[PDB]
Amino acid sequence: QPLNEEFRPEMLQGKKVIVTGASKGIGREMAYHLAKMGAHVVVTARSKETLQKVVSHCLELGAASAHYIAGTMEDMTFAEQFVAQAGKLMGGLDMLILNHITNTSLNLFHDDIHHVRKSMEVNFLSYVVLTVAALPMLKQSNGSIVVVSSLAGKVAYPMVAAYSASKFALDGFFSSIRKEYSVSRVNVSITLCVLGLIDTETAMKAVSGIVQAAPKEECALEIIKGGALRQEEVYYDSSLWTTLLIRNPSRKILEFLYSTSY
Amino acid sequence: QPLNEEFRPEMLQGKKVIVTGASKGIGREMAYHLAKMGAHVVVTARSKETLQKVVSHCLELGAASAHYIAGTMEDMTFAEQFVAQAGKLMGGLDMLILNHITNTSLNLFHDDIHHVRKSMEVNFLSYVVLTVAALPMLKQSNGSIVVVSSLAGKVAYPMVAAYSASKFALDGFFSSIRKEYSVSRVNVSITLCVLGLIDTETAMKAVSGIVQAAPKEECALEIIKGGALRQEEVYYDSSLWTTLLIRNPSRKILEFLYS
Ligand SMILES: NC(=O)c1ccc[n+]([C@@H]2O[C@H](COP(=O)([O-])OP(=O)(O)OC[C@H]3O[C@@H](n4cnc5c(N)ncnc54)[C@H](OP(=O)(O)O)[C@@H]3O)[C@@H](O)[C@H]2O)c1
Ligand SMILES: NC(=O)c1ccc[n+]([C@@H]2O[C@H](COP(=O)([O-])OP(=O)(O)OC[C@H]3O[C@@H](n4cnc5c(N)ncnc54)[C@H](OP(=O)(O)O)[C@@H]3O)[C@@H](O)[C@H]2O)c1
Ligand SMILES: C[C@](O)(c1ccc(C(=O)N(C2CC2)[C@H]2CC[C@H](c3cccnc3)CC2)cc1)C(F)(F)F
Ligand SMILES: C[C@](O)(c1ccc(C(=O)N(C2CC2)[C@H]2CC[C@H](c3cccnc3)CC2)cc1)C(F)(F)F
């Protein structure tokens, strides 16, 4: 049930929200936009040094409140207590933004199984664990889940096999879960975010000299809109060529066709 | 780059082939077809009992050779040793059919993270391990990798989350790997197989009274035909609406866009 209107800041006012991989890039921006709305926000990543700043600056921007908890999403235990600790900190939760990933470079896959396992653990599994942990709270506030994926998670590219495997997984898993929430009349929206190339330090470090990326600041924003407006998918890619084709009716058809079937 | 000519059982004769999850269902059928064709075959799964039955039956259908090695794909050391032992049993390798999955059922997902983790380990991760271990031989023989997937690996159904996540994963990882072989000019084809409901013991059991399945023996042959013709994708379903609906050109186009 996507909402029948457009988005304005107030919708996030005093809304308790989690953001992962929020110490830099798209994550951080999302945190900043979030403050500019006066929402409550807890943020996480590994490094406490950078998290301290994000927290400190979100207050300036006017967040109702802002805190961090550091730990590696390599660690399902941490991911599970993180959500408990944060949500109890804020006495509830309205929107879960799953954004972090393990460190990846661009290269040929070359028998790097350990890196495929780690990608799958951090980028994909941890999202599930995180969701599991928040479901009870999200049911409470008829909240929302937002999952940051890529183009590389809808179609193929070389140089990101592990990465892509994991991004594809999110789609399969969370799109499947939606249909399940529907038929169980569970009212938690789930938004998958197909993002083209974005101007983050990390991304630009690997590209730039292979060329163009969309502005990180707006990306963060569109993500936030799609999530608040409870939309199934959000696309954000600089080239309007792309944004119009990615869609895929054969699937929407095939899914819906086999829905009223049972 | 797919061969541009019909296929003939003559294409698989003397071809040395591994088939995983071949004790029952689609995998068994595949082993049988390959035997009718005179290929060499090594099959695997956990149950030695059922495997013996298969092998023995394969030697009677005419396989150039036919061995088996039982093990769980839950164990990456076994996966890696399998391919070695098999390479030696056949002195090389022409095709690798990744077909096994972990047991599953149709159920709402609450918090079975260990099942999600096992699915990803067995239905996905082992394929990578297997692929990595077989790639050298396959290189030697300009061979093929055949990965068996589903509609649920291309579109979302309720009741199969873990399963889907893993099948989707195969698409992302193998389709991406396909691109890399092309820019590396590695001559080893990769075929992803998208199947609809098939009348295997397990499937029929599971969807007993909640949902027409295709014949598993014809399916088994399509898969092999797609592999030997080096097709990127095979689509097999009882509903021809479906088989034709699934192809995804808006995607093949997009991919070429940034290429
Ligand atoms: N930017 C792009 O070109 C692009 C394109 C498509 C999709 N996306 C998606 O957008 C999201 C963010 O991208 P980005 O470029 O903004 O990333 P980024 O700026 O490089 O930041 C990555 C974040 O994840 C954290 N992280 C790394 N390892 C972690 C771990 N083991 N446990 C917990 N956190 C960890 C990092 O903090 P620590 O190092 O301190 O842990 C950092 O905060 C990702 O989901 C990505 O897939 C990005
Ligand atoms: N049948 C369908 O409706 C359908 C639809 C779409 C896609 N597919 C795909 O087609 C393929 C085969 O399906 P199927 O229905 O033929 O399956 P199946 O008959 O149930 O056979 C599964 C095989 O995998 C083996 N296996 C199970 N757990 C294992 C483990 N831990 N380690 C190693 N092997 C294990 C089983 O033998 P052991 O228990 O002895 O190990 C068995 O040989 C799968 O990739 C499936 O996803 C099937
Ligand atoms: C983590 C990282 O920053 C990263 C990973 C994946 C994507 C990503 O989602 N892609 C955009 C959405 C498609 C990639 C862009 C570059 C593409 C590429 C790289 C090299 C060669 N050909 C294509 C791969 C997909 C962006 C950044 C990386 F890889 F370190 F740069
Ligand atoms: C292993 C198993 O036998 C199985 C799993 C998945 C699929 C599969 O790939 N599907 C076909 C390709 C789509 C399923 C068909 C039924 C679908 C479904 C289930 C419940 C309600 N509506 C549709 C779920 C995917 C087939 C068998 C199972 F799950 F035990 F039944």
Side-chain angles (χ1 to χ4, degrees), chain A residues 109 117 156-157 159 176 180, chain B residues 109 121 157 159 176 180 255:
Chain A
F109 170 86
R117 185 180 256 115
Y157 296 70
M159 311 310 151
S176 165
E180 287 191 355
Chain B
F109 166 97
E121 286 305 325
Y157 301 80
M159 311 314 173
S176 164
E180 308 199 342
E255 303 180 356

Side-chain angles (χ1 to χ4, degrees), chain B residues 11-29:
Chain B
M11 287 163 169
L12 270 323
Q13 176 181 310
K15 294 303 163 279
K16 302 152 196 174
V17 185
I18 283 174
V19 185
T20 86
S23 68
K24 54 228 253 203
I26 312 210
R28 170 158 72 215
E29 297 317 319

Side-chain angles (χ1 to χ4, degrees), chain A residues 11-117:
Chain A
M11 276 171 173
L12 277 307
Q13 207 151 236
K15 292 264 186 276
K16 309 160 211 169
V17 180
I18 287 182
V19 180
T20 78
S23 69
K24 35 173 170 171
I26 312 173
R28 173 176 64 201
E29 308 311 332
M30 281 196 274
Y32 294 158
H33 294 262
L34 273 192
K36 300 187 202 328
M37 336 208 152
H40 303 267
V41 326
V42 170
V43 299
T44 185
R46 283 166 320 167
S47 169
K48 74 199 180 284
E49 290 76 18
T50 60
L51 282 167
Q52 287 154 183
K53 272 156 194 67
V54 187
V55 166
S56 163
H57 182 276
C58 300
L59 293 172
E60 293 168 332
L61 293 173
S65 60
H67 313 264
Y68 75 93
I69 305 162
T72 184
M73 290 299 186
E74 293 177 350
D75 181 323
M76 308 304 136
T77 295
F78 172 77
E80 207 170 304
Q81 293 169 354
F82 163 78
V83 170
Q85 180 180 326
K88 194 200 169 183
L89 182 56
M90 304 182 278
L93 189 79
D94 281 278
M95 174 177 300
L96 175 64
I97 299 193
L98 308 178
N99 178 258
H100 62 105
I101 67 195
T102 197
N103 291 333
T104 333
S105 64
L106 306 175
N107 286 144
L108 311 185
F109 170 86
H110 52 114
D111 315 337
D112 190 351
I113 300 158
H114 80 63
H115 181 238
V116 188
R117 185 180 256 115

Side-chain angles (χ1 to χ4, degrees), chain B residues 22-23 28 31-32 43 50-59:
Chain B
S23 68
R28 170 158 72 215
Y32 293 173
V43 296
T50 287
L51 283 164
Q52 285 160 3
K53 265 77 184 185
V54 187
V55 166
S56 162
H57 199 273
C58 281
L59 284 170

Side-chain angles (χ1 to χ4, degrees), chain A residues 108-109 111 117 120-121 124-125 156-157 159 161 165 168 172 175-176 180 242 245 248 250-251 255 258 262, chain B residues 76 109 117 120-121 124-125 132 154 156-157 159 161 165 168-169 172 176 180 210 242 245 248 254-255 258:
Chain A
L108 311 185
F109 170 86
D111 315 337
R117 185 180 256 115
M120 216 62 261
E121 283 282 332
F124 164 65
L125 194 78
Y157 296 70
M159 311 310 151
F168 263 88
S175 300
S176 165
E180 287 191 355
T242 326
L245 295 174
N248 163 182
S250 317
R251 172 156 161 189
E255 280 177 50
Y258 275 118
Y262 196 35
Chain B
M76 306 300 146
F109 166 97
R117 188 192 263 96
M120 221 69 273
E121 286 305 325
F124 168 66
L125 198 65
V132 164
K154 292 291 196 185
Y157 301 80
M159 311 314 173
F168 269 69
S176 164
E180 308 199 342
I210 343 271
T242 311
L245 257 171
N248 201 184
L254 312 208
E255 303 180 356
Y258 337 108

